[PDB]
Amino acid sequence: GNKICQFKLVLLGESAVGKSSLVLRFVKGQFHEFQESTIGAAFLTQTVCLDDTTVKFEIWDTAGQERYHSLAPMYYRGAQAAIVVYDITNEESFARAKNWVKELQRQASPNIVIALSGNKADLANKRAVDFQEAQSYADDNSLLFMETSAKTSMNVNEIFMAIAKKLPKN
Ligand SMILES: Nc1nc2c(ncn2[C@@H]2O[C@H](COP(=O)(O)OP(=O)(O)NP(=O)(O)O)[C@@H](O)[C@H]2O)c(=O)[nH]1
Ligand SMILES: [Mg+2]
């Protein structure tokens, strides 16, 4: 089809949950076991086919370390969507994700679409966050939830595409 559109997506979450890995998997079909912690933010783009539309994702991959918290609004101001990422093996990272969700609900655009990624789902033998508990949390907060693995690719294209399908369209 011959339509085109573009939107801004921000990833937020505790350091080491796999934000950069998810973006690299989606954008480059790449996964690096040895990824350096991000400084401030990184920016990448992917263009995909969705139905009749060529959709360009402008992706802001934020640094999750607490020392960068005050920069976050620069990165989510203006975003049409967010993915808040946690690590399914780390309950504290899940708690931190909930606080990022609260911040977005209070301070981001009121029409932002927010997804929740329970990442590192390939490490389910070390699970700390019950799937159904996270799904219920997501449902109660109007969040798109998927468990993902940047390492295997599980649900990575799916979560990004599902967001793009739910961006307002008349
Ligand atoms: N097993 C597994 N490891 C993963 C997965 N996603 C990321 N990792 C690993 O987790 C580590 C941290 O990933 P990274 O993408 O740098 O995390 P981040 O959220 O961008 N960290 P920061 O916020 O500090 O930039 C890396 O060693 C990476 O290989 C995944 O789905 N499964
Ligand atoms: Mg990173």
Swiss-Prot record:
Mg(2+) binds at S20, T38. It comes from the Eukaryota. GO terms for cellular component: actin cytoskeleton; axon; axon terminus; clathrin-coated endocytic vesicle membrane; cytoplasm; cytoplasmic side of early endosome membrane; cytosol; dendrite. Changing R106E: No effect on RABEP1 binding affinity. Regulated by guanine nucleotide exchange factors (GEFs) including RINL, which promote the exchange of bound GDP for free GTP. Regulated by GTPase activating proteins (GAPs) which increase the GTP hydrolysis activity. Inhibited by GDP dissociation inhibitors (GDIs). Changing W60A: Strongly decreases RABEP1 binding affinity. A motif (Switch 1) lies at residues 30-42. Keywords: Cell membrane, Cell projection, Cytoplasm, Cytoplasmic vesicle, Endocytosis, Endosome, Glycoprotein, GTP-binding, Hydrolase, Lipoprotein, Membrane, Nucleotide-binding, Phagocytosis, Phosphoprotein, Prenylation, Protein transport, Transport. It is an enzyme of class 3 (hydrolase). It is a lipid-anchor. The modification Phosphoserine is found at S70. A motif (Switch 2) lies at residues 63-79. Switch 1, switch 2 and the interswitch regions are characteristic of Rab GTPases and mediate the interactions with Rab downstream effectors. The switch regions undergo conformational changes upon nucleotide binding which drive interaction with specific sets of effector proteins, with most effectors only binding to GTP-bound Rab. This is Ras-related protein Rab-5A. The chain holds residues 15 to 184 of 215 of the full protein.
